[PDB]
Amino acid sequence: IAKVQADEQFGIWLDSSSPEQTVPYLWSEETPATPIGQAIHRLLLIQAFRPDRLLAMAHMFVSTNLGESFMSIMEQPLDLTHIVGTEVKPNTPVLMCSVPGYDASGHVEDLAAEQNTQITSIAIGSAEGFNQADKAINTAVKSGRWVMLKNVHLAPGWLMQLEKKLHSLQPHACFRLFLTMEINPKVPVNLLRAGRIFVFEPPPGVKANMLRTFSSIPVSRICKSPNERARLYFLLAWFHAIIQERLRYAPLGWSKKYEFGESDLRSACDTVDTWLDDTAKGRQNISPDKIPWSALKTLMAQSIYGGRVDNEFDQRLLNTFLERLFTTRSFDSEFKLACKVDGHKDIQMPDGIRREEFVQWVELLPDTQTPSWLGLPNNAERVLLTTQGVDMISKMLKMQMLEDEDAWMRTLHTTASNWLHLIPQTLSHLKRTVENIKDPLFRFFEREVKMGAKLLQDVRQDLADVVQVCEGKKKQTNYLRTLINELVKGILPRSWSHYTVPAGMTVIQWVSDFSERIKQLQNISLAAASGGAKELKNIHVCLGGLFVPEAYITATRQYVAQANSWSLEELCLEVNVTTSQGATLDACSFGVTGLKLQGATCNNNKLSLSNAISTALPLTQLRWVKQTNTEKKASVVTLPVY
């Protein structure tokens, strides 16, 4: 803290694009540190200050240890020739595991063309596939040919039978069997144990998705009459880029990782072809204004692409994208496909009419790509990397294992001890009278406080038993040994989360959430016991500490409706973000503390788009007013509360 206070040019390091090349010397030392010691010192500094670059910094750490060229073989095309000619035993099938919607058998066909080897390619769908695959393997096990089975994840039991057949096989020294499959946990574990694994991911980027989309569609369909349809296909291809890379940026790009696959593209091409054949009636040219834009927008926002969409906000996002792209204005030569790319640049749509001009423009795309291509802010990339940065560290926490014998429980004794010492021992319960049933907020707080007290008792008894195990006081039960292994790897067990809980989150942030949650529950329980029911409105309630906030919203609605004698269908919502300290609450106003605004800054109930990832909102006064039948102003935006 003293060194970061004393340093003058620290600030340019704080917002640097790649600060890990210029980490400042701040650590106090007595002997001159080694290059690897300097590397771990700057690694800790990068982890502390700017974790977004942290993964990249980890690469430089490997550059300090095992050479600069260590990961240099990844970003090269895969050397299949040397591996299948030298490194693969003929009784070992080569497993090619790709993601769904992606294929890698073209590599096999290219290798079979290059090495001059005959290949029997068989896709498997039924028992005829069983018979043909067994006949092909029984002939090529003597002839020494090459046999590929494609999409073999569909029949796992027959794959178990095939592996048991292959274990007793004595093949020719150049017979090679490939099994190409999707990455799916329906595969047996022993085939991945007894095979050569290869992972084939598509290259990330908008441009590569456009190349794959344009390669998928035949040229004979695209080059049909009328001439405008290919232009539309380019727009359709752009649409299949413009959300799929957005699927890389969950939860900011979409609420969940939807299954926007190849069949959506094929159905979109089919409905575009059918509508253009119904509209043009075979003519060579039609007007851009006579294209049924509403038909395409509706059938691709509701039928083709929107069927997988369940959230209405993602449906609104898809409809805004479709209304921003699939118009007649896109046919104009001055259309910007992506505005404010890197703040000031823009992406203009090419003016060609034939397909090859579009392919040339797509090939002439710049190799630099920012999230502003998709409409996202650039700092979302700054989010996404550091999300994966967390996904590094906990994974290494999974790899701690137990092997240091010739101190896991030696650390875990103190870990469970301080986790016991953090949380209070006993949470008090609220007293049950009749006069606080007329106040629904007390019903909320009692439904909160039993759930909190039971989870407190559960965590306390489990941590007490774990710290008994760490001194040898207790015999290792299956539940206790599983719990102590989960605590070694630092993962949340299933038997610990019992309310609406964030997924994929570790145990230390979990126990910090208990500290804040039952601290807030103890404070509101003491206030409810002391001041009576009337204090229950004036207290500032954090919605994140409650196990259910929609009950709080409905309880505030009921409190207003009972206080002023109005029907529950008549009230509507209003939010005022006040910033002056000690703002006096009104009759229908309830104080909410600790909300976060992602992507904007609010001043005087007025939002402005900002490049900060999050801003801590002050005490929000949530008010319930009468449903006036006023037309909504165009300057009013509906935001979701997650």
Binding site: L154, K186, S263, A295, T298, Q302, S303, R308, I437, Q562
Partner: protein, 1237 residues
């Protein structure tokens, strides 16, 4: 096949002769085998192997020929693929008996439930639906000219299609008049609605509206003239006003359904015409009209399957003219229109549909509505425990052959082999359908064929497969590229309730729906979670239909009272000046409040007052039934109420049960034990027999103590004859009406816990079909005079399918207060005699007996201690704080206390019998009764706890009572008996000291008397007189078994039978004990089981009641059997299926606490009946007495050491006591010390 149906022989004569020869050979061979059943003798018959192989080949030939004949018939008439095997042999074998063919039409066609025939059964004149909707054929089918079954079945299908098309043409020709008239006569419209069927009415309305809108758009021409669209909108608004005025009258339910469907369709027409007018659409080829669903009728088409073409976006379909009867119309929400768009886009792309989402969002009903609107046969296959794989290949063949639709609700719930096999078949069918894409290539369909069940099956282009999924999850990988998914995460409930209310004649259907829809979500969130609460969309729809019925009832009542007076009655006028929120709150309360628990009813009323401000619900006053309830409850010593009194809630619950019997024919009482549910139905029955003057018969059956093969009957596995079960005998006795039983009203009450196994056959009669089927094959219809009832403690193991069909009443514990129990006890004791036996029980007066007067005086004495804030209630609420070996049920302690006070008045009568010179005077009576009440409260509450809690309860009683307790400082009050005089007598003074001989020093039949055994012996002597089933528990070795045996053998009339229970005790143990000791004798009152030893009361010792094992459902068969003997005074003989009664039978039992590993806790319906005593270890004083006696017995061999007897035993006790302080069970489970050591 060759003997069950007699007409299969004439169809296959060669196979009949062949099977006759084969049967002759096989019976001769089997007679030769039956001569010698030795295995080596069967192996040594001459030429037996060649003959067996020849017979096997011949039987295989007959089977192959018959299977090919059945497959030929199934390929002839394609709907034969939808029927089972033996049903198909029944259908073809009953060609000359057409009526037997009538029951199979429901599985075959969509709505054709029967066929209307000639009087001679030679012409099939027409067809009918399930709901009585009928169609006469335009051309009749003459079955004499077409005697083959498949021939006249194809003719029936073709003529139904022809008649449906011609009637649709005439209906649209007549309704095009009403489409263009600004003024509509109600009478001609009602004549049109009553003339034609509901699907034809909705179809003609849709076709006429679509044609008029298309003609209006052609007349618009892009000139900006919105006048004809306004004209069509005004016409449909005029029809809305005409139909909403017509639905407010009194209508038959068929025409009410037709008007409801018409309102539901035409309101959507009004909304879409409003949207079309608002969006300023001027061209007929605009997408805002193309995306809406369109119809085009061509009467000039000769082909009867394409006279109506239904189009939506790019998709077009031809109307299959399948009879659907009267289905349920779906409210066309935006979600429904989006579903229609997605599924029609997937069907035009030759794909399949996957509407995925949570349960209850109208997925499968939307698929069914889409299939019905296009008029195709839809078949919903449930993917939860009703998944037969033996017929689903045949079902897929029928779907591909005749052309139909298939829906699979909850495909996520299937297991792996089901999912793999069905997904492979569906994948193969969908790939065959995707071959129909690219018709330019498919100019030759080459009669398209698919691989199914290892054969080749032709595929119709009108067929479709739909899969419904429940995520939370993704589709199987065989079909993920073949199906189009659609998220139904939330349907629009507000529009559904708006159209449902507006179809029920409600004038203000917007604000009322906007109130009621969030109220159900409020009830689902704010109320505590219960497994029988239903806040779903189906319950909301039922609530709205019931609200329409309540409004119609109020309108009819106003019309009747205005008819009686002299006033002019207009239905619109009396419907105008009338509140609708009161109707909705009345229907909501009258549906929901009987299911509510007592803790959540003021939360429900708070929510209901918040949603509906200032609206209150008033319970319907039934004054005559309440007067008969007052008479019956005053007859049977029961407290009464009239709302917010001591007993009002029980009368409210029994009135709710009366209304549920009026509404639902299957009902349950579902509250906890001891809350009045078991006799409230008898009170209602014996009040209805006085109010209506109709005889009431009740049949109480225990469902779990009697096996399913005994309850419903089992068929003979060989030599097949049908044996009736208990329920089937009851129903057969009702339906035969030999004794005129159908004139009376009969109630069958299944007094026992609910379980899915014995109710699955009851589901076929518990639904609206009301038809019980049997393995015999009889189809029995339940008469309307019968009402199936249930009595269950909880629904811990109740399936949803049975609980959805039954109206329920929750009889909570706070319905019954303790004051009602005290009133029942005092009013029983002031009127019943305790010496009458059985003769005067039918006789239920001042000078009847002196014992009645002395118990009346005792009641007068003990009444001030029986108040709400007196002694007994405070002792009960303090004893509920005490822990016991089992759960302290309130009614158990109260019944035990009442029995012991009965024994107190019996003791007073014994004093007056032994001293006839002067009676029991009032002061000594007051002292005896007031001391005995303290003694009886102490025993009846703290007889199930340790000595420290006996001392604690005695201290609390001493602090809160006025009666003087004995002065002695360190002796608890539980050791002082109340004497027959007014003073306390110590038990230590009452125990004798006996000396036992040397020959039996540790014999298992002798006992040494001490304080504890004489106390417990007096307690069993009190409890055994009134035949209460007594149970003693405690740690092992405490001596309960032989104390019970010695006290039972000491009584001169108790004949003791010692039975032992383990984890394999069926009721056959008790039945064999009754067959060994008792006998059945018939009397004109009824058959009765009695012991052979006349005058001796038989007692069944069962040594370990806890030891029978619980089932999968928390039930014990023998314990429920003993419970029904104690509660009902008898059981059922399954061989004759007749009620027997126990005459001189008791039950006593011993136990161990249920914290022991081999024990199970007892049922709360059985724990109410039993008074339970906790037998502790005897303690140091009792053991010094016992083993001082035993060592003085032992030291008679050696005569020089008498004086070393007594100093030994104390030491022999004392060290043992420190073992009981040192070697605890927690250190090691075998560190157990008892007097057995």
């Amino acid at each position: 096949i060759f003997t069950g149906s007699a007409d299969i022989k004439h169809l296959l004569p060669v196979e009949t002769q062949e099977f006759q020869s084969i049967s002759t050979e096989f019976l001769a061979l089997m007679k030769k085998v039956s001569k010698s059943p030795l295995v080596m003798d069967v192996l040594n018959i001459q030429g037996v192997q060649r003959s067996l192989e020849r017979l096997a080949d011949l039987l295989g030939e007959i089977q192959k020929a018959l299977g090919e004949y059945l497959e030929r018939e199934r390929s002839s008439f394609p709907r034969f693929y939808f029927v089972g095997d033996e049903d198909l042999l029944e259908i073809i074998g009953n060609s000359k008996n057409v009526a037997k063919l009538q029951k199979h039409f429901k599985k075959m066609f969509a709505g054709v439930s029967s066929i209307i025939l000639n009087e001679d059964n030679s012409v099939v004149l027409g067809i009918s639906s399930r709901e009585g909707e009928e169609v006469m054929f335009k051309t009749p089918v003459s079955i004499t000219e077409h005697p083959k079954i498949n021939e006249w079945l194809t003719l029936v299908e073709k003529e139904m299609r022809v008649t449906l098309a011609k009637l649709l043409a005439e209906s649209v020709t007549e309704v095009e008049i009403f489409g263009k008239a600004t003024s509509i006569d109600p009478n001609t419209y009602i004549t049109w609605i009553d003339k034609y069927q509901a699907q034809l009415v909705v179809l003609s309305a849709q076709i006429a509206w679509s044609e008029n809108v298309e003609t209006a758009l052609s007349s618009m021409g892009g000139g900006g003239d919105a006048a004809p669209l306004h004209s069509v909108l005004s016409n449909v608004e005029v029809t809305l006003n005409v139909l909403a005025d017509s639905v407010l009258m009194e209508q038959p339910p068929l025409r009410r359904r037709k008007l409801e469907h018409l309102i539901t369709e035409l309101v959507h027409q009004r909304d879409v015409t409003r949207s079309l007018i608002k969006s300023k659409i001027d061209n007929a080829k605009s997408f805002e009209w193309l995306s809406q669903m369109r119809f085009y009728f061509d009467p000039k088409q000769t082909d009867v399957l394409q006279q109506l073409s239904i189009q939506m976006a790019n998709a077009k379909f031809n109307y299959g003219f399948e009879y659907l009867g009267v289905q349920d119309k779906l409210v066309q929400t935006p979600l429904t229109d989006r579903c229609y768009l997605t599924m029609t886009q997937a069907l035009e792309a030759r794909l399949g549909g996957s509407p995925f989402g949570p349960a209850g969002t109208g997925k499968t009903e939307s698929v069914k509505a889409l299939g019905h609107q296009l008029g195709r046969f839809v078949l919903v296959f449930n993917c939860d425990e009703t998944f037969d794989f033996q017929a689903m290949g045949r079902i897929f063949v029928g779907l591909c052959q005749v052309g139909a639709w298939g829906c699979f609700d909850e495909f996520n719930r299937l297991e792996e082999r089901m999912l793999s096999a069905v997904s492979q078949q569906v994948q193969c069918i969908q790939e065959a359908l995707r071959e129909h894409s690219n018709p330019n290539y498919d100019k030759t369909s080459a009669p398209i064929t698919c691989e199914l069940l290892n054969k080749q099956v032709k595929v119709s282009p009108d067929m479709a497969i739909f899969i419904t999924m429940n995520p939370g999850s993704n589709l199987p990988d065989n079909l993920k590229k073949l199906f189009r998914s659609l998220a139904m995460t939330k349907p629009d409930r507000q529009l559904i309730a708006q159209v449902m209310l507006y179809s029920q004649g409600f004038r203000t259907a917007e604000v009322l729906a906007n109130k009621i829809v969030p109220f159900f979500k409020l009830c689902d969130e704010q109320l505590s979670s219960q497994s029988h609460y239903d806040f779903g969309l189906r319950a909301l729809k039922s609530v709205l239909v019931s609200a329409g019925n309540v409004k119609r009832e109020r309108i009819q009542k106003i019309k009747r009272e205005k008819e009686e007076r002299g006033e002019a009655v207009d239905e619109g006028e009396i419907a105008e000046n009338l509140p609708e929120q009161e109707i909705l709150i009345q229907s909501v309360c009258e549906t929901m409040v009987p299911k509510l628990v007592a803790e959540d009813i003021p939360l429900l009323f708070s929510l209901l007052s918040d949603v509906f401000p200032g609206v209150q619900y008033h319970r319907g006053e039934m004054t005559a039934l309440r007067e008969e309830l007052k008479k019956v409850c005053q007859e049977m010593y029961l407290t009464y109420g009239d709302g917010e009194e001591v007993g009002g809630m029980w009368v409210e619950k029994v009135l709710q049960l009366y209304q549920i019997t009026q509404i639902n024919h299957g009902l349950m009482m579902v509250g906890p034990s001891g809350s009045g549910k078991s006799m409230a139905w008898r009170v209602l029955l014996k009040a209805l027999e006085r109010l209506e003057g109709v005889e009431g018969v009740a049949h109480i059956i225990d469902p779990k103590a009697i096996s399913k093969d005994h309850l419903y009957g089992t068929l003979d596995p060989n030599t097949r004859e049908w044996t009736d079960g208990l329920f089937t005998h009851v129903l057969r006795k009702i339906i035969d009406s030999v004794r005129g039983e159908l004139q009376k009203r009969q109630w069958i009450v299944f007094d026992g816990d609910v379980d899915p196994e014995w109710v699955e056959n009851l589901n076929s009669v518990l639904d609206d079909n009301k038809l019980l089927t049997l393995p015999n094959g009889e189809r029995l219809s339940l008469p309307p005079n019968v009402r199936i009832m249930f009595e269950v403690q909880d629904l811990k193991y109740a399936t949803l399918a049975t609980v959805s069909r039954c109206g329920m009443v929750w009889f909570s514990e706070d319905v019954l207060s303790t004051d009602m129990i005290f009133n029942n006890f005092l009013a029983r004791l002031r009127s019943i005699p305790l010496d009458e036996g059985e003769d005067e029980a039918q006789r239920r007066e001042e000078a009847a007996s002196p014992m009645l007067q002395i118990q009346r005086d005792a009641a007068t004495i003990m009444q001030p201690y029986f108040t709400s804030n007196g002694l007994v209630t405070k002792a009960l609420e303090h004893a509920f704080q005490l822990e016991h070996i089992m759960d302290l049920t309130r009614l158990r302690c109260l019944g035990s206390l009442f029995s012991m006070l009965h024994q107190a008045c019996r003791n007073v009568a014994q004093y007056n019998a032994n001293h006839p010179d002067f009676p029991m005077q009032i002061e000594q009576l007051e002292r005896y009764i007031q001391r005995y009440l303290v003694y009886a409260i102490l025993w009846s509450l703290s007889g199930d706890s340790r000595l420290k809690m006996r001392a604690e309860l005695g201290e609390y009683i001493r602090r809160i009572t006025t009666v003087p307790l004995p002065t002695a400082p360190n002796i608890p009050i539980i050791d002082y008996e109340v004497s027959i005089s007014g003073e306390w007598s110590p038990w230590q003074a009452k125990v004798p000291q006996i000396e036992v001989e040397t020959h039996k020093v540790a014999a298992p039949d002798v006992v040494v008397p001490t304080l504890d055994t004489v106390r417990h012996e007096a307690l069993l002597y009190t409890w055994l007189a009134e035949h209460k089933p007594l149970v003693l528990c405690g740690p092992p070795g405490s001596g309960k078994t032989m104390t019970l045996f010695s006290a039972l053998r000491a009584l001169p009339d108790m004949e003791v039978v010692g039975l032992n229970f383990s984890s394999a005790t069926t009721p056959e143990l008790l039945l064999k004990t009754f067959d060994h000791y008792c006998e059945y004798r018939r009397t004109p009152n009824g058959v009765v089981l009695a012991p052979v030893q006349l005058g001796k009361w038989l007692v069944l010792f069962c040594d370990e009641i806890n030891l029978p094992d619980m089932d999968k459902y928390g039930t014990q068969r023998v314990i429920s059997f003993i419970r029904q003997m104690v509660e009902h005074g008898g059981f059922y003989r399954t061989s004759d299926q007749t009620w027997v009664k126990l005459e001189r039978i008791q039950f006593v039992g011993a136990c161990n606490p249920p914290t022991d590993p081999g024990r199970k806790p007892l049922s709360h319906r059985f724990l109410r009946h039993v008074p339970v005593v906790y037998v502790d270890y005897p303690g140091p004083a009792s053991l010094t007495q016992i083993y001082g006696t035993f060592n003085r017995a032992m030291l008679r061999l050696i005569p020089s050491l008498r004086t070393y007897a007594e100093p030994l035993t104390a030491a022999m006790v004392e060290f043992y006591t420190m073992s009981q302080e040192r070697f605890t069970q927690d250190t090691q489970p075998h560190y157990i010390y008892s007097p057995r050591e």
